[PDB]
Structures are given as structure tokens and as C-alpha cells.
From Swiss-Prot:
The keyword Zinc does not apply. This is Tk-subtilisin. GO terms for cellular component: extracellular region. Its cofactor is Ca(2+). Has a broad substrate specificity with a slight preference to large hydrophobic amino acid residues at the P1 position. The keyword Signal applies. The active site is at D112, H150, A321. It is found in: Secreted. Monomer. Optimum pH is 9.5. Pfam families: Peptidase_S8. Thermostable. Highly active at 80 degrees Celsius. Disulfide bonds: none annotated.
């Protein structure tokens, strides 16, 4: 029938009429990158490569969610609040006195199944919802709703309300943008994910850098997210997707993804990219989980993690998908605090960074170094600790 491809073009020379010429149908045109998602009869893909202004034609790959219910739970109750073990492990609670992440400029975007936006322990922190499914951007809530539970769970780990009920997130007051890039089954196309990343930048207004001041992540005038979190993976390294990642990085957004759960020598994509923080999983006894893909940047609680779940509910899940929000929360705490004290945010930084001058550099040196000294193939730099990190930030 047809297949979905993603074309990188020379925007000046590429004539879109040509794709319609070959029976192609345009799905979505990227704002931030020179690329377009198009459905073509596989008969035409060859024709596409040979067109002028077509630099590359890449295929629509797949990535998948990285968390699974620990006991095959369908979700359950917490009438009274409890603090999940990971939250303590990560030294979050001490921080709340300084900040809970409720500074206004700060948003955290989670690209995942969607969210249960009416969950009592979530709702007040849910700022914006979108779905990028099938290359259609929808802002209607019915589209936005979690049909899997993985995303609602990822989210509670980051933001869940500090209150009478349920559980509580690393950054319990931070603003959430739930960008749904995965289906009911937890499967996603690489193209929809790239669109999700773009949306996280564009923000609700649709305008990236509306002030045209060159500042986004950390500009109050702007609506951009300052932390994109992807508890998902796939094995493909595609050009266009990287490009979108660079776009986010360049906008100063901190990006975090799960290493993957295959006990692999190295992380899944996008975790594998240089500007993305790859997150490993540890357990309650501080062993690295056997499933956790190796060579992460850092690690965090990934085993038996209680969080929110749909229909106003809670559940325990496992995977590097679970580790990922913990890190994301830490960065949110860090940026929110830094921006509460000075009126800016820190640079994202690099993998080698070991200084207090970068968000990553801070994570790198405030982490609890385990196993072999220094960065290691199992723990990465170590286990992320919020309290130390913030201190480094404000120091
Ligand atoms: Ca923002
Ligand atoms: Ca709660
Ligand atoms: Ca701006
Ligand atoms: Ca501004
Ligand atoms: Ca180590």
C-alpha cells in the first residue's frame, strides 16, 4: 500500500509538488529541521532519492517503551501518601525546602504514552498535553490521554503531588508537558518522536523563540520546556532524528533517555547520542539491574518503582524507563533552583563535563560513584543525587 519515509531536503531547491507528482502524500513538515514526513508507494521511493533537493530518504523506524509492571499489576490504591524508595535514594526530599520545581519558566516534557491528566496526584502539575501520533499534532485531550499507563507512571515519578495521597515526585511542583508519542501498546515511530521533540520546543504557542531573542529554554517570555525525557528506545540511528535532537540541545534543553533493557553493551537510541543523557537502572540494594544496557552516563532507581497509574491509581514497574524520570527530576530541581536564585539556567553540558558549571557536569560529580572508581560501564558516573546537585548549583 504505502510506506512512511522522512525526507531531508534542501529547502530552497526541493519542490514539494514533485512528491505529489509521484503519488506521495505529505504528513507533516518540520519547522525546526529541513525535513518532511511523507507517505509513498514503495514503488516511488527510488524516484524520491533522485529528486533535486532530496538529500536523504530515511525510513520510519520503531522504538518502544522501557518499563513493565513488576508483578503484572493493573494498578491499585494508595489512600495515604508514601514516598517511593527511589525518591529517597535520589535525595530529593531534602531539596524541597529550597525548591520543589515550581518556578514558572520551567517545564518538563515527557514523551511517552500520554498521561492521565485527571489523576488527582498529577493534575495540578499538568500544564500542557499533546499527541503526535501518526504525524498529526493534536491538542484535543481525548487524543492526549494515556492508554497504556507507562506515561502516567513516568510522570508521577517526576512530578507527583506532595500531599495527602499517593506518591510524590522528584520535583513535586514542576510543570509538566505530556507529549504522547507512543500508542496504547507502547510502540512508537521514530518520526512521531521527532515531532514530539519539536513540539516540546515549539511549546503550546507554536512559537519557538517568539521574542526572537535567541533564548528559549529558560526564557520566561517563551513557553519552551527545559527538560525532555524519553523513557524509550529503538536500535536505529537515523539522521533526521539526530538533527531534531541537536535542535533541542541547541535550544538549551536538557535531554534524558533510558539506556535500554537488553543487557546490551551499549545504550539504545536516542540515549546513545552524545548530547543525550543515557540513564542506567539500579535496584534497592544498589546493584545495577542485569537488564540495564551498559555504558550509561548515569544511573538511578529502576526496579520495583511505585508511581501513578491511570484511572486514578498506582502501580509498580521496572525498567530503565523508570530510572529515567528520576534523573529528569533532578535536572528540573537543579534548573529551577538555579533560576530561582540567579535568573538564568545552566548550560546543558557534555558527557566529559566534570565541573559545576554545567547541568551534566554537576550530575557527573555529585553522583554516588559506585563499583569501580570513576565512570564505569555499569553505573555510568554514578547514582544521581538531588541534594548534592543543587548545592553544587548554587555554590
Ligand atoms: Ca520554559
Ligand atoms: Ca501525593
Ligand atoms: Ca526567546
Ligand atoms: Ca525573552
Ligand atoms: Ca564508578
Amino acid at each position: 500500500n504505502t510506506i512512511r519515509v522522512i525526507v531531508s531536503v534542501d529547502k530552497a531547491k526541493h519542490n514539494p509538488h514533485e512528491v505529489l507528482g509521484i503519488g506521495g502524500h505529505i504528513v507533516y513538515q518540520f519547522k525546526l529541521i529541513p525535513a518532511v514526513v511523507v507517505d509513498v508507494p514503495a514503488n516511488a521511493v527510488g524516484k524520491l532519492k533522485k529528486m533535486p533537493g532530496v538529500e536523504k530518504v530515511e525510513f520510519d523506524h520503531q522504538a518502544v517503551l522501557l518499563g513493565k509492571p513488576s508483578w503484572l499489576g493493573g494498578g491499585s490504591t494508595q489512600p495515604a501518601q508514601t514516598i517511593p524508595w527511589g525518591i529517597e535514594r535520589v535525595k530529593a526530599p531534602s531539596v524541597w525546602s529550597i525548591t520543589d520545581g515550581s518556578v514558572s519558566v520551567i517545564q518538563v516534557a515527557v514523551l511517552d504514552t500520554g498521561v492521565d491528566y485527571d489523576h488527582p496526584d498529577l493534575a495540578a502539575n499538568i500544564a500542557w498535553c499533546v499527541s503526535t501520533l501518526r504525524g498529526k499534532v493534536s491538542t484535543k485531550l481525548r487524543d492526549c490521554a494515556d492508554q497504556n499507563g507507562h506515561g502516567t507512571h513516568v510522570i508521577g515519578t517526576i512530578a507527583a503531588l506532595n500531599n495527602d495521597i499517593g506518591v510524590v515526585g522528584v520535583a513535586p511542583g514542576v510543570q509538566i508537558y505530556s507529549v504522547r508519542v507512543l500508542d496504547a501498546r507502547g510502540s512508537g515511530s521514530y518520526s512521531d518522536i521527532a515531532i514530539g521533540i519539536e513540539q516540546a520546543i515549539l511549546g503550546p504557542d507554536g512559537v519557538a523563540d517568539k521574542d526572537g531573542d535567541g533564548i528559549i529554554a529558560g526564557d520566561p517570555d517563551d513557553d519552551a520546556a527545559e527538560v525532555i525525557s524519553m523513557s524509550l528506545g529503538g536500535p536505529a540511528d537515523d539522521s533526521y532524528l539526530y538533527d531534531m535532537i541537536i535542535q533541542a540541545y541547541n535550544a538549551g534543553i536538557v535531554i534524558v533517555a533510558a539506556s535500554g533493557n537488553e543487557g546490551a553493551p551499549s545504550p539504545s537510541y536516542p540515549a546513545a547520542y552524545p548530547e543525550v543523557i543515557a540513564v542506567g537502572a539500579i535496584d534497592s540494594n544498589d546493584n545495577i539491574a542485569s537488564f540495564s544496557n551498559r555504558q550509561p552516563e548515569v544511573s538511578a532507581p529502576g526496579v520495583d518503582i511505585l508511581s501513578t497509574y491511570p484511572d486514578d491509581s498506582y502501580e509498580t514497574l521496572m525498567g530503565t524507563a523508570m530510572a529515567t524520570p528520576h534523573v529528569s527530576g533532578v535536572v528540573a530541581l537543579i534548573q529551577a533552583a538555579y533560576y530561582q536564585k540567579y535568573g538564568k539556567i545552566l548550560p546543558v553540558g557534555t558527557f566529559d563535563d566534570i565541573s559545576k558549571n554545567t547541568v551534566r557536569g554537576i550530575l557527573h560529580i555529585t553522583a554516588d560513584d559506585l563499583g569501580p572508581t570513576g565512570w564505569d560501564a555499569d553505573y555510568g558516573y554514578g547514582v544521581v543525587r538531588a541534594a548534592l546537585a543543587v548545592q553544587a548549583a548554587l555554590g
